[PDB]
Amino acid sequence: ALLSFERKYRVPGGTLVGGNLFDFWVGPFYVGFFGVATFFFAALGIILIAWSAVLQGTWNPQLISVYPPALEYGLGGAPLAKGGLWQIITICATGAFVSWALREVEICRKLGIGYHIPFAFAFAILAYLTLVLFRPVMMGAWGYAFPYGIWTHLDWVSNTGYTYGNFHYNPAHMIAITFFFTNALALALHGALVLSAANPEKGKEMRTPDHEDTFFRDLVGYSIGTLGIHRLGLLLSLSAVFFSALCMIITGTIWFDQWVDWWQWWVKLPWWANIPGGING
Amino acid sequence: AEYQNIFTQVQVRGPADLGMTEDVNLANRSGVGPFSTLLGWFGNAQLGPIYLGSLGVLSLFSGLMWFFTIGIWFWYQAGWNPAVFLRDLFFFSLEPPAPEYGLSFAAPLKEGGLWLIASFFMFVAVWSWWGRTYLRAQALGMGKHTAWAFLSAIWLWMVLGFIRPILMGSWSEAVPYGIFSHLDWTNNFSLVHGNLFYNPFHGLSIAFLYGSALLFAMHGATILAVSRFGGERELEQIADRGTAAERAALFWRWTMGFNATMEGIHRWAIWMAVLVTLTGGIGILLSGTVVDNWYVWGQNH
Amino acid sequence: FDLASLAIYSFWIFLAGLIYYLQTENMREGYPLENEDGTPAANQGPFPLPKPKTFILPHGRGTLTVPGPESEDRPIALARTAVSEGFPHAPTGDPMKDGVGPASWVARRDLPELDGHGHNKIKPMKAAAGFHVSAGKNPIGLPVRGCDLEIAGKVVDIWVDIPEQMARFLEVELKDGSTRLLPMQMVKVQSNRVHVNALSSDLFAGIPTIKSPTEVTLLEEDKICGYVAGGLMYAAPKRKS
Ligand code: BCL
Ligand code: BCL
Ligand code: BCL
Ligand code: BCL
Ligand SMILES: CC[C@H]1c2cc3[nH]c4c(c3C)C(=O)[C@H](C(=O)OC)c4c3nc(cc4[nH]c(cc(n2)[C@@H]1C)c(C(C)=O)c4C)[C@@H](C)[C@@H]3CCC(=O)OC/C=C(\C)CCC[C@H](C)CCC[C@H](C)CCCC(C)C
Ligand SMILES: CC[C@H]1c2cc3[nH]c4c(c3C)C(=O)[C@H](C(=O)OC)c4c3nc(cc4[nH]c(cc(n2)[C@@H]1C)c(C(C)=O)c4C)[C@@H](C)[C@@H]3CCC(=O)OC/C=C(\C)CCC[C@H](C)CCC[C@H](C)CCCC(C)C
Ligand SMILES: COC(C)(C)C(=O)C/C=C(\C)CC/C=C(\C)CC/C=C(\C)CCCC/C(C)=C/CC[C@@H](C)CC/C=C(\C)CCC=C(C)C
Ligand SMILES: CCCCCCCC/C=C/CCCCCCCC(=O)OC[C@@H](O)COP(=O)(O)O
Ligand SMILES: CCCCCCCC/C=C/CCCCCCCC(=O)OC[C@@H](O)COP(=O)(O)O
Ligand SMILES: CCCCCCCC/C=C/CCCCCCCC(=O)OC[C@H](O)CO
Ligand SMILES: CCCCCCCCCCCC[N+](C)(C)[O-]
Ligand SMILES: CCCCCCCCCCCC[N+](C)(C)[O-]
Ligand SMILES: CCCCCCCCCCCC[N+](C)(C)[O-]
Ligand SMILES: [Fe+3]
Numbered sequence: 001a002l003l004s005f006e007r008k009y010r011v012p013g014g015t016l017v018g019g020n021l022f023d024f025w026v027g028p029f030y031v032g033f034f035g036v037a038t039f040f041f042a043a044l045g046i047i048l049i050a051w052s053a054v055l056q057g058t059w060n061p062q063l064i065s066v067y068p069p070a071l072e073y074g075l076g077g078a079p080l081a082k083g084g085l086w087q088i089i090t091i092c093a094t095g096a097f098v099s100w101a102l103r104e105v106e107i108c109r110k111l112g113i114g115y116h117i118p119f120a121f122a123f124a125i126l127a128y129l130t131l132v133l134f135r136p137v138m139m140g141a142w143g144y145a146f147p148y149g150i151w152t153h154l155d156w157v158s159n160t161g162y163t164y165g166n167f168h169y170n171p172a173h174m175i176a177i178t179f180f181f182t183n184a185l186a187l188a189l190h191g192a193l194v195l196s197a198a199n200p201e202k203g204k205e206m207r208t209p210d211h212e213d214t215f216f217r218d219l220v221g222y223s224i225g226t227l228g229i230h231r232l233g234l235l236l237s238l239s240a241v242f243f244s245a246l247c248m249i250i251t252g253t254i255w256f257d258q259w260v261d262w263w264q265w266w267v268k269l270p271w272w273a274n275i276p277g278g279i280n281g
Numbered sequence: 282a283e284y285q286n287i288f289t290q291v292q293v294r295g296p297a298d299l300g301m302t303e304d305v306n307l308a309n310r311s312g313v314g315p316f317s318t319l320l321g322w323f324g325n326a327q328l329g330p331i332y333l334g335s336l337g338v339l340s341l342f343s344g345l346m347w348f349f350t351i352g353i354w355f356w357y358q359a360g361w362n363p364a365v366f367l368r369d370l371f372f373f374s375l376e377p378p379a380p381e382y383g384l385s386f387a388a389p390l391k392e393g394g395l396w397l398i399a400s401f402f403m404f405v406a407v408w409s410w411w412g413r414t415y416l417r418a419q420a421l422g423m424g425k426h427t428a429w430a431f432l433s434a435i436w437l438w439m440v441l442g443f444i445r446p447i448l449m450g451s452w453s454e455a456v457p458y459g460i461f462s463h464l465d466w467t468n469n470f471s472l473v474h475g476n477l478f479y480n481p482f483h484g485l486s487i488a489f490l491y492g493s494a495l496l497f498a499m500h501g502a503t504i505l506a507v508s509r510f511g512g513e514r515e516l517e518q519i520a521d522r523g524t525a526a527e528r529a530a531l532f533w534r535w536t537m538g539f540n541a542t543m544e545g546i547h548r549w550a551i552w553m554a555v556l557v558t559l560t561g562g563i564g565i566l567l568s569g570t571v572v573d574n575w576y577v578w579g580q581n582h
Numbered sequence: 583f584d585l586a587s588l589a590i591y592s593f594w595i596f597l598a599g600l601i602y603y604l605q606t607e608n609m610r611e612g613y614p615l616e617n618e619d620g621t622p623a624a625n626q627g628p629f630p631l632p633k634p635k636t637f638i639l640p641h642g643r644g645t646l647t648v649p650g651p652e653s654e655d656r657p658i659a660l661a662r663t664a665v666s667e668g669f670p671h672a673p674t675g676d677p678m679k680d681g682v683g684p685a686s687w688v689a690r691r692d693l694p695e696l697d698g699h700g701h702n703k704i705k706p707m708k709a710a711a712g713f714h715v716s717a718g719k720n721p722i723g724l725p726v727r728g729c730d731l732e733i734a735g736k737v738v739d740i741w742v743d744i745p746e747q748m749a750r751f752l753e754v755e756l757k758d759g760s761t762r763l764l765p766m767q768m769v770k771v772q773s774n775r776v777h778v779n780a781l782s783s784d785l786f787a788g789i790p791t792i793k794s795p796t797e798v799t800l801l802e803e804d805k806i807c808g809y810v811a812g813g814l815m816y817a818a819p820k821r822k823s
Contacts, residue, residue: 001623001667003534003612004652005527008660011683012670013815025668030535107535111528112684112811114285114509116502123498154478168464184493184554188430191551196424198519198544198637204422205640209516210698210745211421213325214300218310218417219427221331225746226513228324231287234501237494263371263461272368277360279372283779286767291749293707293742294716301698318717325747326716481590509767510807511750517695520639520646521800522611524688524808530612545608552600563589571585582587 001027014109016102030110034103038096045092049148052085065149068132071141078142089148090132097125120234123241130245138253164251165258172247173259179240186236190229286508292321299330305420309334336413344406350399351375351458357391374459375399377452384451399458400442411435430555437558440566448570470565475574482564483575489556496553500546503529518543606632610648618667641700643693655689658682678788678809678816685812690800697745702797704750706739709796713742719771726754726764726776727783729813729821734783735762737776741798751798751806752776754786762789763798763806780813782820 002010015023017033024031053064069076069083078084104118132145146156161167168174193215197207213223224232255262267273267280275281284290297313314329355373359365378385378393388394415428446454456463471477478484504512512518512525522543530540541549572578606629613631615623637646659680660671673682681687695703707713715722722740725733734756741751741763751763770777781789790805792798798806 001615001625002618003530003540004614004616005522005612005654005688006531006534007616007618007620007671008654008658008682008686009528009531009684010671011660011673011677012663013683020670023670025535027668028534028538104532104536107532108506109815110684111532111535112808112814113528113532114506116285116506117499117532120498120502124495151479158476158478166464166468168468169461180490180494183497184490184557185434187493187497187550188433188554189427190497191547191549191554192426192430194515194547195544195551196418196426197516198547199424199426201419201422201424205638206516206520207421207423208301208640208696208698209514210298211301211303211423212516213298213745214305214698215417215421215423215427217300217330218305218332218420219414221311221314221329222325223327224324225748226515227286227508227746227748230501230504230508230513231323232501233497234287234505237498237501240494267368267372269368272364275362275365275368277362278358278365279369281365281368282770284767284770289748290718290769290771291715291721291740291766292717293713293740293747293749295710295713295742295744295747298745298747316716321717327747481586482593485593509765509811511803514695517800520637520643521690522688523690523800524686524804526611527686527688539605541608542611545604545610548604548607552604560593563593567586567589578586 009111011110014111015106016109030103030107032103032106034099034106037099038103041092041095041099045089045096048085048089048092051080052089055081055085062150065147065152067147067149067152068136068142068145071143073143074141075137083142086145086148087142090145094125094129094133097121097128101125116234120238123238127241127245130249135249135251135253138249144252160251164255165260167259169259169262170247170251171259171262172243172250176240176243176247179236179243183233183236183240186229186233190233193229286505288322292318292326294321294326297327301421303421305332306334309337332417334413334416336409336416340406340409340413343402343409347399347402347406350395350402354395354399371460372462374457374462376457376462377446377455380451380453382451382453384447388452393452396455396458397452400455404443407435407438426551430551433555433558433562437562437565440562445566445568445570448566454569470568474568474572475578476576477564477568479575479579480564480568480572481579482560482567486557486561486564489553489560493554493557496550499533500550503532506532515543515547602629605629610635612652613649618662618671640698641696643691656681678785678812681805681808681812683812684815685808687801687804687808690804692799692801694797694799701744703745704741704743704798704803706741706753706796708739710742710744713744713747715740719773721752721769721771721776724771724774724776726752726769726778726786728781728786729779729817730782730784731822732783733775734778734781734786756787758787760787760791762786763792764789765807765810768810778810779821780810780817782813782817784820785813785817 012020012023015032022031022033022036049066052066053059056064058064066086066089068086069078073083077087101118101121105115108115136142136144146153193212197212200207209226216223294316310332311330316326317328318326320326354375356366358373359369375396377396378388382388382393386397411428411431414431415425418425418427442455446452456466507525507529510523510525512529518526526543534540609632615626617623631649634647634649639646659673659675660682661674663669663672673680677683678685697703721737724737726735726737728734735754737752738755738761739753740749741753743750749766751766752769753761754764755761764778768778768780789809792802
């Protein structure tokens with residue numbers, strides 16, 4: 001079935017691999033070579049998760065947990081039941097995600113639109129690859145990656161964070177959080193602004209973009225503009241994820257102490273370290 | 282190098298836009314400010330005008346009195362030494378009364394009383410700012426969506442500093458005013474309550490915080506990808522669907538099997554963000570008042 | 583089953599209702615679903631069509647009610663390539679000229695978008711008193727180069743969104759002395775030229791023309807913007823790697 005305006009866009013073309021061989025849809029979904037690739041990677045990854053659940057003895061999705069190899073395996077391969085399944089599933093997930101992004105690129109090309117969306121999605125993939133690939137390789141073991149389980153990967157975040165004291169003191173982490181909070185603030189404001197113009201007070205004509213500019217100028221003295229706010233939302237969310245990847249790629253590679261030490265440089269500067277009083281004297 | 286419309290190539294400038302009037306009391310609207318070529322690379326260059334008004338000045342006066350009360354406490358904690366001030370800036374903290382004082386307003390100035398005074402001023406600053414987000418939209422004939430979304434943020438802030446402390450029985454439960462101290466407060470809160478990762482309202486709050494970045498990256502990128510058809514002019518696209526709105530929808534339909542409208546994506550957006558602090562506020566409010574230990578509580582449910 | 587259990591189960595019920603509301607709200611355009619031959623589809627999925635809402639449009643422009651009866655309001659020069667569903671529909675003529683695929687346009691109002699004061703939102707800079715280039719390379723006077731690396735014309739004006747103070751189109755003079763509008767988001771201003779990857783120089787004259795020299799309608803914008811973007815696919819045989 002199609003949306004009422006959709007047929008005119010379902011033309012051949014835009015694929016990057018395979019010519020027209022995979023150039024078709026299944027219901028609403030576009031296929032393409034990377035749709036087929038996505039299906040293969042995802043189906044196999046899901047099969048190996050089911051395998052690992054069989055070995056674990058549970059079908060409870062809240063208990064299934066696929067653990068990476070023990071640290072002693074270093075960067076080597078491991079037996080299926082002792083980290084190998086995690087290893088193959090990780091390859092499958094990487095393959096599915098990258099195939100997803102390239103499928104989007106084919107969709108972008110058939111529709112004649114910019115490539116911003118798979119470019120943005122690539123930041124999420126790089127954050128995933130930081131945690132399971134780049135950081136484990138640089139630390140010397142797959143076993144530093146997170147396990148694939150609903151609650152056990154939260155225990156991994158807890159264990160990893162408290163290895164460094166209060167992880168709040170990681171400064172790149174502070175920047176990432178600031179981008180995450182500011183992004184949600186901006187998303188709330190942007191959704192509210194548009195809806196407040198399109199759904200005005202009862203008894204009113206639909207507002208214009210000039211009402212949006214005026215509202216935000218009256219409120220805080222600046223309106224970033226309709227183009228500006230979408231650039232801004234993209235930059236905030238991408239920067240949060242960039243600084244997330246940055247705060248973790250340095251943790252355990254070039255920084256090993258309690259993160260609260262980083263700022264203590266400021267504390268013990270020779271010209272005020274020993275002044276009696278305050279907090280740091 | 283194909284152009285991607287993240288930064289402007291050619292800036293243009295004309296007479297300042299003074300804005301819509303509708304029912305805005307122009308007596309309280311400043312003149313227009315200067316233009317910023319720096320900002321014009323990314324968004325609009327025009328600064329101002331801003332609306333003042335009684336609620337604004339009350340909010341500003343009170344918000345500055347909050348900031349000054351904390352600041353004066355910091356100078357006192359620093360022995361009035363400016364170098365000690367700058368050195369320990371992030372370590373100072375205006376702390377609430379000790380638990381012995383309960384909800385009493387009799388805690389002496391230097392042991393919690395100044396925290397109460399700063400909190401009074403903050404309480405007045407936020408709620409009059411909230412009134413301002415409502416009255417600015419109403420003066421312009423607009424929906425009240427901004428004030429309603431802002432209420433969700435205020436909900437979490439009210440829980441942290443007011444509602445939960447009162448239900449727990451003492452101001453000592455409230456968040457202190459300092460950079461590092463309020464971070465230490467946050468860490469301690471979770472340890473005291475049996476791992477906040479197992480507070481299901483905390484897990485929802487995270488789902489919507491991550492989901493807000495997921496959605497704004499999706500939507501921001503989508504609108505830039507269709508800005509070559511005027512996509513960011515979302516109101517007229519709502520009124521009169523164009524090829525921008527149609528291609529944006531079909532990208533997502535073809536990618537994930539369903540899609541939005543130019544209007545409806547902004548409903549997805551406002552709820553994704555609002556639910557962050559809505560669920561978050563519920564999660565904090567239940568901590569200690571109802572659930573002592575989220576991990577233990579989770580295992581029994 | 584304490585208050586926290588009651589809260590969390592309640593919230594999940596609320597969330598299921600919110601998602602159902604959000605999805606139906608996002609069916610105000612394009613639904614009901616159609617078969618590939620344009621007739622209504624039998625399977626519309628589990629979410630029902632939203633009930634109509636109305637927007638009263640400013641400046642005497644009337645009212646929009648959505649959902650409402652939907653029509654492309656234009657001929658679509660495409661034909662099925664398959665009896666069964668899910669296969670591409672192939673252009674029967676010149677897809678760029680017929681406005682299909684990535685060249686598609688929508689039958690928007692043949693009127694200009696207006697600002698909050700009821701004035702045309704987009705105007706050529708020569709008709710916009712006080713507007714000027716404020717930073718970056720001024721493209722006026724530069725030659726415009728296509729993806730065949732040949733020159734198609736000269737930039738004679740910038741069309742500006744007045745309320746957002748934004749360049750939206752370059753007005754380009756062709757060899758015959760007519761002009762076309764080029765979307766600002768589809769050009770790269772360089773020090774000595776404006777390069778347009780999307781079109782080869784021979785396709786610039788096919789850009790749909792505007793009926794008035796000082797304004798552009800939403801319908802015309804859609805046709806210009808669709809045509810030019812459509813060149814990424816359909817002028818690719820002319821694009822030098
Ligand atoms: C949610 C659970 C915790 C908590 C956990 C964290 C963690 C963890 C982090 C922060 C971070 C920050 N938090 Mg906190 N935070 C809490 C509640 C608050 C409240 C409040 C009224 O409730 C405030 C004002 C702040 C303020 C701040 C900022 C210092 C900083 C960036 C916030 C941001 O991106 O805002 C989005 C809003 C805007 C961009 C608008 C402008 C906001 C400005 C910057 C706020 C100014 C605050 C203060 C008055 C500035 C004084 C600066 C100098 C000392 C003079 N937090 C609660 C109690 N917060 C991060 C940080 O950098 O810490 C150092 C960080 O890593
Ligand atoms: C006790 C725990 C520690 C701590 C330890 C850590 C550790 C350890 C880490 C973080 C990380 C982060 N923490 Mg911290 N953190 C603490 C307290 C906080 C507080 C707070 C209010 O106190 C906040 C706001 C944060 C915030 C954050 C973010 C900056 C970041 C998580 C986002 C991210 O990386 O996205 C990145 C996004 C992704 C990884 C998602 C990728 C998704 C992929 C590409 C696609 C998936 C598709 C899916 C399988 C499809 C399914 C099927 C379909 C749905 C149909 N932390 C405390 C002090 N924090 C993490 C980080 O920065 O990681 C880089 C991290 O590892
Ligand atoms: C990002 C930094 C940390 C981390 C820190 C946290 C913390 C802390 C929390 C979560 C929470 C969650 N995380 Mg995690 N998370 C990490 C990496 C991941 C990855 C991944 C492939 O990288 C995935 C798929 C998940 C998935 C999830 C969900 C189970 C849950 C809600 C997230 C959400 O809505 O996000 C935004 C995305 C969307 C709204 C889109 C829809 C996403 C859906 C819900 C994903 C389902 C995945 C499925 C259960 C598992 C694989 C499916 C396959 C078919 C087998 N996390 C890393 C290690 N994550 C929360 C929770 O409640 O956990 C129990 C929580 O509190
Ligand atoms: C060791 C630390 C603990 C923990 C302790 C807490 C505590 C404690 C809390 C959170 C909360 C949250 N945590 Mg946690 N958190 C941990 C681990 C994590 C991880 C992670 C990957 O490890 C993540 C991603 C998160 C993420 C989150 C957020 C989803 C949530 C805050 C939402 C928000 O927007 O607040 C930011 C928004 C606000 C605080 C609202 C602010 C509104 C007011 C009105 C602003 C006024 C501005 C003021 C006047 C200043 C003006 C300045 C001028 C502009 C200049 N936490 C661990 C387990 N977390 C909060 C929550 O809701 O929990 C359920 C909370 O209170
Ligand atoms: C970089 C900014 C933010 C971002 C952006 C972003 N994400 C995106 C996109 C964009 C722009 C897409 O285009 C794409 C999409 O289509 O969204 C609808 C995507 C998407 N982001 C998703 C999820 C997601 N994004 C997240 C985060 C973010 N995404 C960032 C905060 C998070 C978290 C934890 O915060 C999650 C869970 C999906 C909805 C979607 C990608 C869908 C996809 O890749 O599909 C192909 C793969 C499958 C259908 C299944 C693969 C199965 C694996 C083989 C097995 C399981 C492996 C996995 C590691 C197990 C994990 C267990 C958990 C319990 C930890
Ligand atoms: C849906 C939840 C998200 C959200 C939403 C949200 N926040 C909002 C809104 C919304 C919808 C608003 O409408 C409102 C707003 O106006 O936004 C622009 C607001 C807002 N959210 C804010 C902050 C904020 N929101 C946050 C979070 C979030 N807000 C969530 C992610 C956070 C954090 C911790 O993450 C913060 C810090 C403000 C920008 C604003 C509320 C403004 C307010 O209440 O102000 C009262 C205070 C004052 C008027 C003055 C304070 C004084 C200054 C601190 C002093 C500065 C120094 C000065 C130079 C000293 C010099 C003095 C001399 C000149 C005399
Ligand atoms: C240069 O020096 C001078 C003196 C000029 C300055 O001004 C410098 C000033 C500073 C250095 C200021 C520095 C300020 C900070 C570091 C502030 C940091 C603030 C935070 C991190 C905020 C954390 C969270 C705060 C919260 C959650 C508060 C909630 C409180 C409210 C819910 C209000 C509760 C109301 C109460 C208790 C009052 C009751 C009274 C009634 C009448 C209702
Ligand atoms: C006690 C249990 C926890 C309760 C916590 C409540 C805390 C305060 C919550 C505020 C609610 C915020 C969610 C609303 C966001 C959606 C806004 C929206 O879309 O509103 C549309 C409309 O309707 C209102 O607009 P108008 O009709 O123009 O006023
Ligand atoms: C098993 C699951 C069963 C679930 C059944 C329903 C459970 C209860 C759910 C409640 C949530 C209902 C939808 C909440 C969203 C609020 C709707 C709303 O806001 O409507 C008014 C709105 O248009 C006006 O907004 P504007 O037009 O933008 O002013
Ligand atoms: C008098 C001079 C004082 C100048 C003080 C400057 C500080 C204000 C900064 C705001 C950043 C923008 C906040 C994010 C805006 C989100 C809301 C939105 O969608 O804006 C859209 C656009 O503005 C209309 O369509
Ligand atoms: C303008 C001041 C606002 C006051 C509201 C909060 C009252 C707290 C008073 C601090 C207690 C001082 N005292 C008298 C007990 O020493
Ligand atoms: C308005 C957008 C709706 C997105 C809904 C996201 C659901 C995420 C589920 C996270 C599960 C949290 N928990 C602890 C209850 O399991
Ligand atoms: C967790 C957030 C994701 C919400 C999922 C919304 C699913 C909507 C699917 C609607 C199907 C539309 N369709 C195909 C009938 O046209
Ligand atoms: Fe938008």
